[PDB]
Amino acid sequence: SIKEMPFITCDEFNGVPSYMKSRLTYNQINDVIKEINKAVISKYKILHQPKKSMNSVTRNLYHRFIDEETKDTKGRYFIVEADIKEFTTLKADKKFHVLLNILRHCRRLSEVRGGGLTRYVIT
């Protein structure tokens, strides 16, 4: 029952301010949403995995996921930049943070900081 980010619609996309849209095409934003969802699912499948079934690489990820929990993330779904790198071939560059800003505007994610870490909380 892992939480996924819904695709942006025609109406929604036409309604985000022009300067944000910039270079970014409509399929571009939705393609990125697919990849972010892939990372969310990958992370949370590991979290829900029986610990005795974990190999060394999975346990190391599991440990990092636990290190990144806070009281503000309890019962919520989030990823960080390392997850994008771990589970996707998405480049976390300038265009990517521009993309993230459209996602925040369309209320698909928000940010939980602290511990010097930016967490992207789904929804």
Numbering used by the authors: 2 to 124
Q: What does the article say, verbatim?
A:
To understand the structural basis for the ability of human Ska complex to bind MTs, we obtained crystals of the Ska1–MTBD in two different crystal forms that diffracted X-rays to about 2 Å. Models from crystal form I (space group C2221) and II (space group P32) were refined to 2.1 and 2.3 Å with R factors of 19.6 and 22.5, and Rfree factors of 25.1 and 26.8, respectively, and superpose well with an overall root mean square deviation of 0.6 Å. Residues 133–142 are stabilized in an extended conformation, followed by eight α-helical segments (α1–α8) and a C-terminal β-hairpin. The structural analysis showed that the Ska1–MTBD is related to a winged-helix domain, a domain known for its ability to bind DNA and in mediating protein–protein interactions. The Ska1–MTBD differs from the canonical winged-helix domain by the incorporation of two additional modules. Analysis of the electrostatic surface potential revealed the existence of contiguous positively charged patches all over the Ska1–MTBD surface, suggesting the potential involvement of multiple MT contact sites. Although mutations at K170/177 and K135/203/206 showed no major effects on MT binding, mutations at R155/236/245, a region reported recently to be critical for MT binding, together with two new regions identified in this study, K183/184/203/206 and K217/223/226/227, all showed significant reductions in MT binding (Kd=20±4.5, 17.1±5.5 and 14.5±2.8 μM, respectively, versus WT=2.9±0.6 μM), pointing to the existence of multiple MT interaction sites. Confirming this notion, a combination of R236/245A with R155A resulted in stronger reduction in MT binding than R236/245A alone, and the simultaneous mutation of multiple clusters (K183/184/203/206/217/223/226/227/R236/245A) almost completely abolished MT binding. These results provide clear evidence that the human Ska complex binds MTs through a multipartite binding mode of Ska1–MTBD. Remarkably, the tubulin contact sites are dispersed across the surface of the Ska1–MTBD and distances between different contact sites range between 15 and 30 Å.
Originally discovered in a proteomics screen, the Ska complex is now recognized as a key element required for maintaining stable KT–MT attachments. The ternary Ska complex, composed of Ska1, Ska2 and Ska3, localizes to the outer KT in a KMN-dependent manner. Although GST–Ska1133–255 is not strictly equivalent to the FL Ska1 dimer in the native complex, and thus might bind MTs differently, it clearly interacted with MTs more efficiently than Ska1133–255. These observations suggest that Ska1133–255 (from now on referred to as MTBD) is the major MT-binding element within the Ska complex, which, on dimerization, can bind MTs more efficiently. Here we have used biochemical and high-resolution structural analysis to show that the human Ska complex interacts with MTs through the C-terminal domain of Ska1, which forms a variant form of winged-helix domain.
